[PDB]
C-alpha cells in the first residue's frame, strides 16, 4: 500500500421543504467508487467506478439498506441536535459523518476514523485508541454518555479492524488496474508578460495520480512557497489531477528560478527553468 477507504456522509435539514437530504460518497485512495443520494429517484447505493459494477445485487441490497437506516438515523439526530442547541425549527442544519480506515502495507488496520460535525463544526469524534470519544461541547457530552452506555465504540472499533479492511482489500483487487496505477505529472512553465519589468511564470502539474503532490518554486535555494500563487489541487474529470504554482519575477532573471515537482510516480523530483 498504503491505502485507504472513506465514506463522507452528509445530512442537511430542510425546514418546510420535506425531509432532509442524505448523501453518502465512498472513496478508495483518491478515487470515488460509491454513492447514495436521498434526492435521487429510487435512492440506493450505486457504483460510480466501472470496476464496482462487478459486484452482485446482494452487495447492493445490503449497502442500500444501511444507507436507508442512516437516513432515518439522521432525521432524528438532526432534530435532537436542534433541541440540544435550542435552535428554532425553521432553520436548516447540517450534520456530517466521516468514517473509513487507513491501512498499512501489511494490509492490517493502521488508523480508524469515525467522527461527526454539526453545522460545520466538530461535534464528537472517536479517538485513536478506538475506545474513547472526544466531544466538542457540553451538548456533545450527552451524546458521549449515550454512546458509551451502548458500547458503540466497541462495534465501530470492530468494524474498522475487520469490515472496511477486508472490503478494502477486495475493492483494491476489483479496481487494481486503476487503483494501483500511478500517473506521473506532466509539467511545464508558461510565460506571462505581467508589467514592463515583471512576468508571471507558472509551472503546471497535469495528469497525475494520487492527488497528493508537491509543487514549489525556488530562487537560488530560496523556497518561495509563501510568495507563490498556488491553487488547491484539482480533479480533471478523467481520474487524474492538475495543479499549478505561479511566481512573479523580473525580466532577464527568469532563468534564476526553478520549479520543483515531487510525486509518487516520479523516481526523482522534476525541475524546470524558463528560456
Amino acid at each position: 500500500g498504503p491505502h485507504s477507504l472513506r465514506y463522507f456522509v452528509t445530512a442537511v435539514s430542510r425546514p418546510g421543504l420535506g425531509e432532509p437530504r442524505f448523501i453518502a460518497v465512498g472513496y478508495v485512495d483518491d478515487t470515488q467508487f460509491v454513492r447514495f443520494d436521498s434526492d435521487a429517484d429510487n435512492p440506493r447505493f450505486e457504483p460510480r467506478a466501472p470496476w464496482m459494477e462487478q459486484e452482485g445485487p446482494e452487495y447492493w441490497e445490503e449497502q442500500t439498506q444501511r444507507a436507508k437506516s442512516d437516513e432515518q438515523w439522521f432525521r432524528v439526530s438532526l432534530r435532537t441536535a436542534q433541541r440540544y442547541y435550542n435552535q428554532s425549527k425553521g432553520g436548516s442544519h447540517t450534520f456530517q459523518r466521516m468514517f473509513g480506515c487507513d491501512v498499512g502495507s501489511d494490509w492490517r488496520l493502521l488508523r480508524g476514523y469515525q467522527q461527526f460535525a454539526y453545522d460545520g463544526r466538530d461535534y464528537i469524534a472517536l479517538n485513536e485508541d478506538l475506545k474513547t470519544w472526544t466531544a466538542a461541547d457540553t451538548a456533545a457530552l450527552i451524546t458521549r454518555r449515550k454512546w458509551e452506555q451502548a458500547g458503540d465504540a466497541e462495534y465501530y472499533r470492530a468494524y474498522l479492524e475487520g469490515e472496511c479492511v477486508e472490503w478494502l482489500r477486495r475493492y483494491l483487487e476489483l479496481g487494481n488496474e486503476t487503483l494501483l496505477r500511478t500517473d506521473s505529472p506532466k509539467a511545464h512553465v508558461t510565460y506571462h508578460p505581467r508589467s514592463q519589468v515583471d512576468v508571471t511564470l507558472r509551472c503546471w502539474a497535469l495528469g497525475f495520480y494520487p492527488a497528493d503532490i508537491t509543487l514549489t518554486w525556488q530562487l537560488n535555494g530560496e523556497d518561495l512557497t509563501q510568495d507563490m500563487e498556488l491553487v488547491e489541487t484539482r480533479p480533471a474529470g478523467d481520474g487524474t489531477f492538475q495543479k499549478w504554482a505561479a511566481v512573479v519575477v523580473p525580466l532577464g532573471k527568469e532563468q534564476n528560478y526553478t520549479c520543483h515537482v515531487h510525486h509518487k510516480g516520479l523516481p526523482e523530483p522534476l525541475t524546470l527553468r524558463w528560456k
Binding site: 465512498g26 442512516d70 432524528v76 468514517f99 452506555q149 458503540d152 465501530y156
Partner: peptide
C-alpha cells in the same frame, strides 16, 4: 462497505 450508525445523538 458502508456501515450503519448505531445509537442516536
Amino acid at each position: 462497505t458502508y456501515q450503519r450508525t448505531r445509537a442516536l445523538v
